[PDB]
Coordinates of all heavy atoms in Angstrom, one line a residue:
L201 N -61.3 42.2 259.4 CA -61.1 41.5 260.7 C -62.2 40.4 260.8 O -61.9 39.3 261.1 CB -61.0 42.5 261.9 CG -60.7 41.8 263.2 CD1 -59.6 40.8 263.1 CD2 -60.5 42.7 264.4
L202 N -63.5 40.8 260.7 CA -64.6 39.8 260.8 C -64.3 38.6 259.9 O -64.4 37.5 260.4 CB -65.9 40.4 260.4 CG -66.4 41.5 261.4 CD1 -67.8 42.1 261.0 CD2 -66.4 41.0 262.8
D203 N -63.9 38.8 258.7 CA -63.7 37.8 257.7 C -62.6 36.9 258.2 O -62.6 35.6 258.1 CB -63.3 38.3 256.3 CG -64.4 38.9 255.6 OD1 -65.6 38.8 256.0 OD2 -64.2 39.5 254.5
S204 N -61.5 37.5 258.8 CA -60.4 36.7 259.2 C -60.7 35.7 260.3 O -60.0 34.7 260.5 CB -59.2 37.7 259.6 OG -59.5 38.3 260.9
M205 N -61.7 36.1 261.1 CA -62.1 35.2 262.2 C -62.5 33.8 261.8 O -62.4 32.9 262.6 CB -63.4 35.8 262.9 CG -63.1 37.1 263.7 SD -61.8 36.8 265.1 CE -62.5 35.3 265.8
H206 N -62.7 33.6 260.5 CA -63.0 32.2 260.0 C -61.8 31.3 260.1 O -61.8 30.2 260.7 CB -63.6 32.1 258.6 CG -64.9 32.8 258.5 ND1 -66.1 32.3 259.0 CD2 -65.3 33.9 257.8 CE1 -67.1 33.1 258.7 NE2 -66.6 34.1 258.0
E207 N -60.7 31.8 259.7 CA -59.4 31.0 259.7 C -59.0 30.9 261.2 O -58.6 29.8 261.5 CB -58.3 31.7 258.9 CG -57.3 30.7 258.4 CD -55.9 31.3 258.1 OE1 -55.8 32.5 258.0 OE2 -55.0 30.5 257.9
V208 N -59.1 31.9 261.9 CA -58.8 31.8 263.4 C -59.6 30.6 264.0 O -58.9 29.8 264.7 CB -59.2 33.1 264.1 CG1 -59.1 33.0 265.6 CG2 -58.4 34.3 263.6
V209 N -60.9 30.6 263.8 CA -61.7 29.6 264.5 C -61.5 28.2 263.9 O -61.5 27.3 264.6 CB -63.2 30.0 264.4 CG1 -64.1 28.9 265.0 CG2 -63.4 31.3 265.2
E210 N -61.2 28.2 262.6 CA -60.9 27.0 261.9 C -59.7 26.3 262.7 O -59.8 25.1 262.9 CB -60.5 27.2 260.5 CG -60.4 26.0 259.6 CD -59.8 26.3 258.2 OE1 -59.9 27.4 257.8 OE2 -59.3 25.3 257.6
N211 N -58.7 27.0 263.0 CA -57.6 26.5 263.7 C -57.9 26.1 265.1 O -57.7 25.0 265.6 CB -56.4 27.5 263.7 CG -55.8 27.8 262.3 OD1 -55.7 26.9 261.5 ND2 -55.6 29.1 262.1
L212 N -58.5 27.1 265.9 CA -59.0 26.9 267.2 C -59.7 25.6 267.4 O -59.6 24.9 268.4 CB -59.9 28.0 267.7 CG -59.1 29.3 267.9 CD1 -60.1 30.5 268.2 CD2 -58.1 29.1 268.9
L213 N -60.6 25.3 266.4 CA -61.4 24.1 266.5 C -60.6 22.8 266.2 O -60.8 21.8 266.9 CB -62.7 24.2 265.7 CG -63.7 25.2 266.2 CD1 -64.8 25.4 265.2 CD2 -64.2 24.8 267.6
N214 N -59.7 22.8 265.3 CA -58.9 21.7 265.1 C -58.2 21.2 266.3 O -58.2 20.1 266.7 CB -57.9 21.9 264.0 CG -58.4 21.6 262.6 OD1 -59.1 22.4 262.0 ND2 -57.9 20.4 262.1
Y215 N -57.5 22.2 267.0 CA -56.7 21.8 268.2 C -57.6 21.6 269.4 O -57.2 21.0 270.4 CB -55.8 23.0 268.5 CG -54.7 22.7 269.5 CD1 -54.4 21.3 269.8 CD2 -53.9 23.7 270.1 CE1 -53.4 21.0 270.7 CE2 -52.9 23.4 271.0 CZ -52.7 22.1 271.3 OH -51.7 21.8 272.2
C216 N -58.9 21.9 269.3 CA -59.9 21.6 270.3 C -60.5 20.3 270.0 O -60.6 19.4 270.9 CB -61.0 22.7 270.3 SG -62.4 22.3 271.4
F217 N -61.0 20.0 268.8 CA -61.6 18.7 268.4 C -60.6 17.6 268.6 O -60.9 16.6 269.1 CB -62.1 18.8 266.9 CG -63.3 19.7 266.7 CD1 -63.6 20.0 265.5 CD2 -64.0 20.2 267.8 CE1 -64.7 20.9 265.2 CE2 -65.1 21.0 267.6 CZ -65.5 21.3 266.3
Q218 N -59.3 17.9 268.1 CA -58.3 16.9 268.2 C -58.1 16.5 269.7 O -58.0 15.2 269.9 CB -56.9 17.5 267.7 CG -55.8 16.5 267.6 CD -54.8 16.9 266.5 OE1 -55.1 17.2 265.4 NE2 -53.5 16.7 266.9
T219 N -58.0 17.4 270.5 CA -57.9 17.1 272.0 C -59.1 16.3 272.5 O -58.9 15.5 273.4 CB -57.8 18.5 272.8 OG1 -56.6 19.2 272.4 CG2 -57.7 18.2 274.2
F220 N -60.2 16.6 271.9 CA -61.5 15.9 272.3 C -61.5 14.4 271.9 O -62.1 13.6 272.5 CB -62.7 16.7 271.7 CG -64.0 16.2 272.2 CD1 -64.5 16.6 273.4 CD2 -64.7 15.3 271.4 CE1 -65.7 16.1 273.8 CE2 -66.0 14.8 271.8 CZ -66.5 15.2 273.1
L221 N -60.9 14.1 270.7 CA -61.0 12.8 270.1 C -59.8 11.9 270.7 O -59.9 10.7 270.5 CB -60.9 12.9 268.6 CG -62.1 13.5 268.0 CD1 -61.9 13.6 266.4 CD2 -63.4 12.8 268.3
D222 N -58.8 12.5 271.2 CA -57.6 11.8 271.7 C -57.9 11.1 273.1 O -58.2 11.8 274.1 CB -56.4 12.7 271.8 CG -55.1 11.9 272.0 OD1 -55.2 10.7 272.4 OD2 -54.0 12.4 271.6
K223 N -57.7 9.8 273.1 CA -58.1 9.0 274.2 C -56.9 9.0 275.2 O -57.0 8.9 276.4 CB -58.4 7.6 273.8 CG -59.0 7.5 272.4 CD -59.0 6.1 271.8 CE -59.0 6.2 270.3 NZ -60.0 7.1 269.7
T224 N -55.7 9.1 274.7 CA -54.4 9.2 275.5 C -54.4 10.4 276.4 O -53.6 10.6 277.3 CB -53.2 9.1 274.7 OG1 -52.8 10.5 274.3 CG2 -53.4 8.2 273.4
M225 N -55.4 11.4 276.1 CA -55.4 12.6 276.9 C -56.7 12.7 277.7 O -57.7 13.1 277.3 CB -55.3 13.8 275.9 CG -54.1 13.8 275.1 SD -54.2 14.8 273.6 CE -54.1 16.5 274.2
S226 N -56.6 12.1 278.9 CA -57.7 12.2 279.9 C -58.1 13.7 280.1 O -57.4 14.3 281.0 CB -57.4 11.5 281.2
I227 N -59.0 14.2 279.4 CA -59.4 15.6 279.5 C -60.9 15.8 279.6 O -61.7 15.3 278.7 CB -58.8 16.4 278.3 CG1 -59.1 17.8 278.5 CG2 -59.3 15.8 277.0 CD1 -58.5 18.5 279.7
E228 N -61.4 16.4 280.6 CA -62.8 16.6 280.9 C -63.4 17.8 280.2 O -62.9 19.0 280.4 CB -63.1 16.7 282.4
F229 N -64.4 17.6 279.4 CA -65.3 18.7 278.8 C -66.6 18.6 279.5 O -67.1 17.5 279.8 CB -65.5 18.5 277.3 CG -64.3 18.7 276.5 CD1 -63.3 17.7 276.3 CD2 -64.0 19.9 275.8 CE1 -62.2 17.9 275.5 CE2 -62.9 20.1 275.0 CZ -62.0 19.1 274.9
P230 N -67.2 19.7 279.9 CA -68.6 19.6 280.4 C -69.6 19.3 279.3 O -69.3 19.5 278.1 CB -68.9 21.1 280.9 CG -67.6 21.9 280.5 CD -66.8 21.1 279.6
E231 N -70.7 18.7 279.7 CA -71.6 18.1 278.7 C -72.2 19.0 277.6 O -72.0 18.7 276.4 CB -72.8 17.4 279.4 CG -72.4 16.2 280.3 CD -73.6 15.5 281.0 OE1 -74.7 15.3 280.4 OE2 -73.4 15.1 282.1
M232 N -72.6 20.2 278.0 CA -73.0 21.2 277.0 C -72.0 21.2 275.9 O -72.5 21.1 274.7 CB -73.1 22.5 277.7 CG -73.5 23.7 276.8 SD -75.1 23.6 276.1 CE -75.3 25.2 275.5
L233 N -70.8 21.4 276.2 CA -69.7 21.6 275.1 C -69.5 20.2 274.4 O -69.4 20.2 273.2 CB -68.4 21.9 275.8 CG -67.9 23.3 275.5 CD1 -68.2 23.8 274.1 CD2 -68.4 24.3 276.5
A234 N -69.4 19.2 275.1 CA -69.1 17.9 274.5 C -70.1 17.6 273.4 O -69.8 17.2 272.3 CB -69.1 16.7 275.6
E235 N -71.4 17.9 273.8 CA -72.5 17.8 272.9 C -72.3 18.6 271.6 O -72.3 18.1 270.4 CB -73.8 18.3 273.5 CG -75.0 17.9 272.9 CD -76.2 18.6 273.5 OE1 -76.5 19.7 273.1 OE2 -76.9 18.0 274.4

């Protein structure tokens, strides 16, 4: 299970980073996170 968490997070971050880089999506992240 611990090992599998890498693939899980790999995906989670793609869909998170993608949302972060998209300008057409006015979406607020707090500074701590944005950093």
Side-chain angles (χ1 to χ4, degrees), residues 201-225 227 229-235:
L201 183 48
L202 293 181
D203 285 355
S204 73
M205 288 302 311
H206 296 290
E207 207 205 348
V208 172
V209 176
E210 192 188 338
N211 296 317
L212 292 178
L213 289 174
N214 270 79
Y215 193 16
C216 172
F217 292 167
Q218 185 154 317
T219 299
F220 187 81
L221 295 177
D222 196 338
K223 329 165 208 312
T224 86
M225 301 157 77
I227 183 63
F229 291 83
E231 294 181 42
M232 179 66 166
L233 248 328
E235 200 190 80

